[PDB]
Amino acid sequence: STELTVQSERAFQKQPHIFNNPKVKTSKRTKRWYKNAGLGFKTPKTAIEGSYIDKKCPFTGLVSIRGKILTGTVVSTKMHRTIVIRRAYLHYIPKYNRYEKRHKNVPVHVSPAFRVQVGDIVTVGQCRPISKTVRFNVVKVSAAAAXXXXXXXXX
Amino acid sequence: ARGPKKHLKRLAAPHHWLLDKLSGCYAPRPSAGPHKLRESLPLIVFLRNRLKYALNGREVKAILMQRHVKVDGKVRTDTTYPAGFMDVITLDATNENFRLVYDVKGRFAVHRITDEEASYKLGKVKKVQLGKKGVPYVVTHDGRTIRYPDPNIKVNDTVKIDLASGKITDFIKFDAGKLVYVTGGRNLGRIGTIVHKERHDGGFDLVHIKDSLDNTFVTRLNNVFVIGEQGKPYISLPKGKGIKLSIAEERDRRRAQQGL
Amino acid sequence: GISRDSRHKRSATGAKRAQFRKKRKFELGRQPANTKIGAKRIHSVRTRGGNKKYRALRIETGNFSWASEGISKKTRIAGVVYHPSNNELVRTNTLTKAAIVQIDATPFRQWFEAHYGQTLGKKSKNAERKWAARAASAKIESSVESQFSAGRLYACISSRPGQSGRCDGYILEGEELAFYLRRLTAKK
Amino acid sequence: PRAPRTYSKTYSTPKRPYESSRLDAELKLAGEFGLKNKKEIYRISFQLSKIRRAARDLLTRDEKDPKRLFEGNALIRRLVRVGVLSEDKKKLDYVLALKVEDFLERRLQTQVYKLGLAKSVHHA
RNA sequence: UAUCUGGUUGAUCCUGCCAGUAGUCAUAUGCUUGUCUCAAAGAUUAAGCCAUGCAUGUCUAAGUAUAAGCAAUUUAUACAGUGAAACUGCGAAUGGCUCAUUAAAUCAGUUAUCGUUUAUUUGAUAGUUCCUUUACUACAUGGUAUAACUGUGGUAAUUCUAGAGCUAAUACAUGCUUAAAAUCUCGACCCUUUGGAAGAGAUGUAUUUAUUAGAUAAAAAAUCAAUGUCUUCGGACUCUUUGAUGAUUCAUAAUAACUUUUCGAAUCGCAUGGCCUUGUGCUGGCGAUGGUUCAUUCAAAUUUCUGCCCUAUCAACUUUCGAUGGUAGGAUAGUGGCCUACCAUGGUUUCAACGGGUAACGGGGAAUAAGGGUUCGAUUCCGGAGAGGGAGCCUGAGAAACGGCUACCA
RNA sequence: GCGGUAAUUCCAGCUCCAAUAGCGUAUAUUAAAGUUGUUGCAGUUAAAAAGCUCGUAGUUGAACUUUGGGCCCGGUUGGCCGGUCGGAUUUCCAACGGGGCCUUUCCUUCUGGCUAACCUUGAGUCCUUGUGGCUCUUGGCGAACCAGGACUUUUACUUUGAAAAAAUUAGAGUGUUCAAAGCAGGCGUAUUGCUCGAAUAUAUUAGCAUGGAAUAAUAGAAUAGGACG
RNA sequence: ACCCACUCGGCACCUUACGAGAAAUCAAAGUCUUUGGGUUCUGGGGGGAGUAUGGUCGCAAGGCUGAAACUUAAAGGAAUUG
RNA sequence: GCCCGUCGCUAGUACCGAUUGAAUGGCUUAGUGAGGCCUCAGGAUCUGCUUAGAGAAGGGGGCAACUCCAUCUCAGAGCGGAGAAUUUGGACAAACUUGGUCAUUUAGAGGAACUAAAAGUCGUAACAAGGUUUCCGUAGGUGAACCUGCGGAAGGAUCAU
RNA sequence: UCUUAAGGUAGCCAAAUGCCUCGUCAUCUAAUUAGUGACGCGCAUGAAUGGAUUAACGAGAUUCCCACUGUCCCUAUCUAC
Ligand SMILES: [Mg+2]
Ligand SMILES: [Mg+2]
Ligand SMILES: [Mg+2]
Ligand SMILES: [Mg+2]
Ligand SMILES: [Mg+2]
Ligand SMILES: [Mg+2]
Ligand SMILES: [Mg+2]
Ligand SMILES: [Mg+2]
Ligand SMILES: [Mg+2]
Ligand SMILES: [Mg+2]
Ligand SMILES: [Mg+2]
Ligand SMILES: [Mg+2]
Ligand SMILES: [Mg+2]
Ligand SMILES: [Mg+2]
Ligand SMILES: [Mg+2]
Ligand SMILES: [Mg+2]
Ligand SMILES: [Mg+2]
Ligand SMILES: [Mg+2]
Ligand SMILES: [Mg+2]
Ligand SMILES: [Mg+2]
Ligand SMILES: [Mg+2]
Ligand SMILES: [Mg+2]
Ligand SMILES: [Mg+2]
Ligand SMILES: [Mg+2]
Ligand SMILES: [Mg+2]
Ligand SMILES: [Mg+2]
Ligand SMILES: [Mg+2]
Ligand SMILES: [Mg+2]
Ligand SMILES: [Mg+2]
Ligand SMILES: [Mg+2]
Ligand SMILES: [Mg+2]
Ligand SMILES: [Mg+2]
Ligand SMILES: [Mg+2]
Ligand SMILES: [Mg+2]
Ligand SMILES: [Mg+2]
Ligand SMILES: [Mg+2]
Ligand SMILES: [Mg+2]
Ligand SMILES: [Mg+2]
Ligand SMILES: [Mg+2]
Ligand SMILES: [Mg+2]
Ligand SMILES: [Mg+2]
Ligand SMILES: [Mg+2]
Ligand SMILES: [Mg+2]
Ligand SMILES: [Mg+2]
Ligand SMILES: [Mg+2]
Ligand SMILES: [Mg+2]
Ligand SMILES: [Mg+2]
Ligand SMILES: [Mg+2]
Ligand SMILES: [Mg+2]
Ligand SMILES: [Mg+2]
Ligand SMILES: [Mg+2]
Ligand SMILES: [Mg+2]
Ligand SMILES: [Mg+2]
Ligand SMILES: [Mg+2]
Ligand SMILES: [Mg+2]
Ligand SMILES: [Mg+2]
Ligand SMILES: [Mg+2]
Ligand SMILES: [Mg+2]
Ligand SMILES: [Mg+2]
Ligand SMILES: [Mg+2]
Ligand SMILES: [Mg+2]
Ligand SMILES: [Mg+2]
Ligand SMILES: [Mg+2]
Ligand SMILES: [Mg+2]
Ligand SMILES: [Mg+2]
Ligand SMILES: [Mg+2]
Ligand SMILES: [Mg+2]
Ligand SMILES: [Mg+2]
Ligand SMILES: [Mg+2]
Ligand SMILES: [Mg+2]
Ligand SMILES: [Mg+2]
Ligand SMILES: [Mg+2]
Ligand SMILES: [Mg+2]
Ligand SMILES: [Mg+2]
Ligand SMILES: [Mg+2]
Ligand SMILES: [Mg+2]
Ligand SMILES: [Mg+2]
Ligand SMILES: [Mg+2]
Ligand SMILES: [Mg+2]
Ligand SMILES: [Mg+2]
Ligand SMILES: [Mg+2]
Ligand SMILES: [Mg+2]
Ligand SMILES: [Mg+2]
Ligand SMILES: [Mg+2]
Ligand SMILES: [Mg+2]
Ligand SMILES: [Mg+2]
Ligand SMILES: [Mg+2]
Ligand SMILES: [Mg+2]
Ligand SMILES: [Mg+2]
Ligand SMILES: [Mg+2]
Ligand SMILES: [Mg+2]
Ligand SMILES: [Mg+2]
Ligand SMILES: [Mg+2]
Ligand SMILES: [Mg+2]
Ligand SMILES: [Mg+2]
Give the separation between CA B144 and CA B107, rounded to whole angstroms.
23
- In a 10 Å sphere around its CB, with 0-12 CB exposed, 13-18 middle and 19+ buried, how is residue A104 labelled? exposed
- The domain locations on chain D are 17-124
Give the separation between CA B72 and CA B65, rounded to whole angstroms.
17
Q: B161 has which bridge partners?
A: B121, B168
D12 beta carbon to strand F: under 7 Å:
no
CA distances (Å), origin C115, targets C122, C146, C155: 18, 19, 21
Reduced to 3 states (helix: H, G, I; strand: E, B; else coil), residue D68 is: helix
Among B170, B155, B64, CA closest to B120: B170
- In a 10 Å sphere around its CB, with 0-12 CB exposed, 13-18 middle and 19+ buried, how is residue A57 labelled? buried
Give the separation between CA D11 and CA D34, rounded to whole angstroms.
18
- In a 10 Å sphere around its CB, with 0-12 CB exposed, 13-18 middle and 19+ buried, how is residue C88 labelled? exposed
Distance of CA D61 to the CA centre of its chain: 23
H or E element, residue B44: helix B43-44
Alpha helices in chain D (DSSP H): 20-33, 39-59, 66-82, 100-104, 108-114
Sheet holding B125-130, edge to edge: B125-130, B136-140, B145-147
Q: Are A110 and A74 in contact (CB under 8 A)?
A: no
Residues of chain B contacting D66 with CB distance shorter than 8 Å: 246-248
Give the separation between CA A140 and CA A46, rounded to whole angstroms.
12
CA distances (Å), origin B246, targets A52, A118, B243, D66: 64, 57, 10, 10
Q: Are C98 and C81 in contact (CB under 8 A)?
A: no
Beta strand A136-141 pairing with A121-127: antiparallel
B254–chain D Cβ distance below 8 A for any pair: no
- In a 10 Å sphere around its CB, with 0-12 CB exposed, 13-18 middle and 19+ buried, how is residue D79 labelled? buried
Helices C142-149 and C174-185 sit at what angle, rounded to 10 degrees? 60
B250 CA: nearest nucleotide by C1': F199
A37: closest chain B residue by CA: B202
Beta strand B158-161 pairing with A98-109: unpaired
Give the separation between CA B127 and CA B145, rounded to whole angstroms.
10
Give the separation between CA B99 and CA B110, rounded to whole angstroms.
8
Amino acid at C41: R
DSSP state string for C60-100: -EEEEEEGGGTEEEEEE--EEEE-SS-HHHHHTT---TT-E
H or E element, residue B42: strand B41-42
Helices D20-33 and D39-59 sit at what angle, rounded to 10 degrees? 100
Q: How far is C40 from chain A (nearest CA, A)?
A: 28
Q: How far is A21 from chain B (nearest CA, A)?
A: 30
Measured at the alpha carbon of residue B69, what is the angle toward residues B67 and B71, in degrees to the nearest 5? 115
Give the separation between CA D101 and CA A145, rounded to whole angstroms.
81
Give the separation between CA B246 and CA B251, rounded to whole angstroms.
8
Among C140, C66, C68, C55, CA closest to C103: C66
Q: B206 has which bridge partners?
A: B198, B220
Q: Please name the chains neighbouring A, where neighbouring means 3+ C-beta pairs under 8 angstroms.
A: B, C
> Long-range CB contacts (< 8 A, 24+ apart) of B192-199?
B192/B242, B193/B230, B194/B224, B197/B221
Shortest CB distance from C141 goes to which of A14, A22, A132? A22
- Which positions ≥6 away from C39 have C-beta within 8 Å? C58, C60
Q: C42 has which bridge partners?
A: C56
CA distances (Å), origin C69, targets C51, C137, D49: 35, 10, 94
B10–chain D Cβ distance below 8 A for any pair: yes
Q: B179 has which bridge partners?
A: B228
- CA-CA-CA-CA torsion sign (C167, C168, C173, C175): negative
Give the separation between CA D124 and CA D120, rounded to whole angstroms.
6
Residues of chain A contacting C68 with CB distance shorter than 8 Å: 19, 21-23
Among B12, B66, B40, CA closest to B184: B40
- The domain locations on chain C are 1-30, 31-105+152-188, 106-151
Write phi, then psi, for D110 (nearest 5 degrees). Answer: -80, -25
Query: What is residue A117's DSSP assignment?
Result: -
Q: Are B94 and B88 in contact (CB under 8 A)?
A: no
Sheet holding B96-99, edge to edge: B69-71, B88-91, B96-99
- CA-CA-CA-CA torsion sign (D30, D33, D37, D42): negative
Q: Are B101 and B110 in contact (CB under 8 A)?
A: no
> Long-range CB contacts (< 8 A, 24+ apart) of A44-49?
A44/A113, A44/A114, A46/A112, A46/A113, A46/A114, A47/A111, A47/A113
Give the separation between CA C157 and CA C64, rounded to whole angstroms.
8
Chain discontinuities in chain C, listed by preceding residue (C to N exceeding 2.5 Å): 122
Beta-strand ranges (E) seen in B79-190 are: 82-83, 88-91, 96-99, 101-102, 108-109, 121-122, 125-130, 136-140, 145-147, 158-161, 168-172, 179-182
Q: In angstroms, what is the resolution? A: 3.2
Give the separation between CA D36 and CA A43, rounded to whole angstroms.
86
Q: Which letter, b or e, does each residue of B61-98 get, where b requires 16 or more Cβ atoms within 10 Å of its Cβ? A: bebbeeebbebbbeebebbbbbbbbbbbbbbeeeebbb
Query: What is residue A20's DSSP assignment?
Result: -
Give the separation between CA D24 and CA A130, rounded to whole angstroms.
80
B251–chain D Cβ distance below 8 A for any pair: yes
- Which of A's residues 71-100 have CB atoms within 7 A of nucleic strand F? 71, 90-92, 95-97, 100
Reduced to 3 states (helix: H, G, I; strand: E, B; else coil), residue B112 is: strand
B247–chain D Cβ distance below 8 A for any pair: yes
Write phi, then psi, for A101 (nearest 5 degrees). Answer: -65, 120
Among B220, B187, B212, CA closest to B106: B187
- Which positions ≥6 away from C70 have C-beta within 8 Å? none
Among A107, A104, A38, A108, CA closest to A66: A38
Beta-strand ranges (E) seen in A19-147 are: 65-79, 82-93, 98-109, 121-127, 136-141
CA distances (Å), origin D22, targets A17, A38, D25: 93, 77, 5
H or E element, residue B248: helix B247-254
Query: What is residue B225's DSSP assignment?
Result: E
DSSP percent split of chain A into helix, strand, coil, nearest 5: 5, 35, 60
Interface touch B201/A39, C-beta < 8 Å: yes
Among C102, C100, C39, C107, CA closest to C72: C107
- In a 10 Å sphere around its CB, with 0-12 CB exposed, 13-18 middle and 19+ buried, how is residue D92 labelled? buried
Give the separation between CA B174 and CA B221, rounded to whole angstroms.
11
Reduced to 3 states (helix: H, G, I; strand: E, B; else coil), residue D18 is: coil
- Which positions ≥6 away from C16 have C-beta within 8 Å? C10
Q: B82 has which bridge partners?
A: B42
Distance of CA A153 to the CA centre of its chain: 32
DSSP state string for chain C: -EE--SSSS--TT-------S---GGGEE-------BSS--EEEEE-SSS-EEEEE-SB-EEEEEEGGGTEEEEEE--EEEE-SS-HHHHHTT---TT-EEE---HHHHHHHHHHHS--S----HHHHHHHHHS-SS----HHHHHHHHTT--EEEE-S-HHHHS---EEE--HHHHHHHHHHHHTT-
Q: Are D110 and D124 in contact (CB under 8 A)?
A: yes
Region of C139 on the Ramachandran plot (φ > 0 left; ψ -120 to 50 alpha; else beta)? alpha
Among C48, C106, C54, CA closest to C76: C106
- Nearest-Å Rg of the Cα atoms of chain B is 19
Distance of CA C47 to the CA centre of its chain: 24
Q: A89 has which bridge partners?
A: A102
C55 beta carbon to strand H: under 7 Å:
yes
Give the separation between CA B40 and CA B108, rounded to whole angstroms.
9
DSSP state string for B5-27: ----BTTTS-GGG---SSS-SB-
- The domain locations on chain B are 1-116, 121-171, 174-244
Shortest CB distance from C176 goes to which of A9, A12, A23? A12
CA distances (Å), origin C97, targets C61, C79, C161: 15, 14, 7
Give the separation between CA B49 and CA B66, rounded to whole angstroms.
19
Among B123, B194, B129, CA closest to B161: B123
Q: Are A81 and A56 in contact (CB under 8 A)?
A: yes
Give the distance, in angstroms, between residue C88 CA and nucleotide H6 C1': 89
CA atoms within 13 A on the CB side of C33: 27
Give the separation between CA C140 and CA C177, rounded to whole angstroms.
14
CA distances (Å), origin A83, targets A51, A145, B112: 21, 16, 64
Give the separation between CA A45 and CA A114, rounded to whole angstroms.
10
Give the separation between CA C169 and CA C108, rounded to whole angstroms.
14
- Which positions ≥6 away from B108 have C-beta within 8 Å? B16, B17, B41, B46, B50, B85, B100, B101, B102
Site from A5, A9, A10, A133 to mutate, C interface, most C CB atoms within 10 angstroms? A10
Q: How far is B14 from chain D (nearest CA, A)?
A: 15
CA atoms within 13 A on the CB side of B234: 24
Measured at the alpha carbon of residue B85, what is the angle toward residues B81 and B90, in degrees to the nearest 5? 60
Beta strand A65-79 pairing with A121-127: antiparallel
Reduced to 3 states (helix: H, G, I; strand: E, B; else coil), residue B159 is: strand
Residues of chain C contacting A5 with CB distance shorter than 8 Å: none
Write phi, then psi, for B97 (nearest 5 degrees). Answer: -135, 120
Helices D39-59 and D66-82 sit at what angle, rounded to 10 degrees? 150
DSSP state string for B51-86: S-S-SSHHHHHHHHTTT-EEETTB----TT-EE-TT
Shortest CB distance from A23 goes to which of C68, C98, C179? C68
- CA-CA-CA-CA torsion sign (D62, D65, D67, D68): positive
